[PDB]
UniProtKB/Swiss-Prot annotation:
Keyword presence, Lipid biosynthesis: no
InterPro entries: EF-hand-dom_pair, EF_Hand_1_Ca_BS, EF_hand_dom, Parvalbumin
GO molecular function, one term: calcium ion binding
Protein name: Parvalbumin beta
Organism of provenance: Cyprinus carpio (Common carp)
Pfam families named in the record: EF-hand_7
SUPFAM superfamilies: EF-hand (SSF47473)
Record: residues binding Ca(2+) 2: D90, D92, D94, K96, E101
EF-hand domain span: 38-73, 77-108
PANTHER family: PARVALBUMIN, PARVALBUMIN ALPHA
Family to which the UniProt record says this protein belongs: Belongs to the parvalbumin family.
Record-listed N-acetylalanine modification sites: A1
Residues the entry annotates as binding Ca(2+) 1: D51, D53, S55, F57, E59, E62
Further remark: This parvalbumin has an isoelectric point of 4.25.
Length: 108
C-alpha cells in the first residue's frame, strides 16, 4: 500500500473490486485507488514503485505483478488482463510502458 501516496482504505476497496480472474479494469482501478486526482509528481512516484527493477520502463513481467505493489498478497493479473493493460498504455509499440505513456494512461 502506497502509505505516503494513497489512502489505505481506497486501495482495499480497489483490490476488493477486481478479485475475480479477468475482472481488472485500469481506469476503474486508478479512479477508485485515488491516483487520478494526483499531480504529475505523484504520478511519477507511482511509476517508480511499479518499475520494480528501475529500468525506466514497466515491462510485461512487472505489469503482471501490478496489484502486488499495492498489497503484497494480491493476485497476479492474467495474461489476458496483462495484454490489455499493456496495449492500452504502450502508445509507441515497444512492448513496455515508459513514464509518459504511464502519465497519459493514468490521466486520460
Ligand atoms: Ca522495469
Ligand atoms: Ca512503450
Amino acid at each position: 500500500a502506497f502509505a505516503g501516496v494513497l489512502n489505505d482504505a481506497d486501495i482495499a476497496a480497489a483490490l476488493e473490486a477486481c478479485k475475480a480472474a479477468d475482472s481488472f479494469n485500469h481506469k476503474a482501478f486508478f479512479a477508485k485507488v485515488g491516483l487520478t486526482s494526483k499531480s504529475a509528481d505523484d504520478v511519477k512516484k507511482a511509476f517508480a514503485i511499479i518499475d520494480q527493477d528501475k529500468s525506466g520502463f514497466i515491462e510485461e513481467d512487472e505489469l503482471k505483478l501490478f496489484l502486488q505493489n499495492f498489497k503484497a498478497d494480491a493476485r497476479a493479473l492474467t495474461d489476458g488482463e496483462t495484454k490489455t493493460f499493456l496495449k492500452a498504455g504502450d502508445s509507441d509499440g515497444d512492448g513496455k510502458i515508459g513514464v509518459d505513456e504511464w502519465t497519459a494512461l493514468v490521466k486520460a
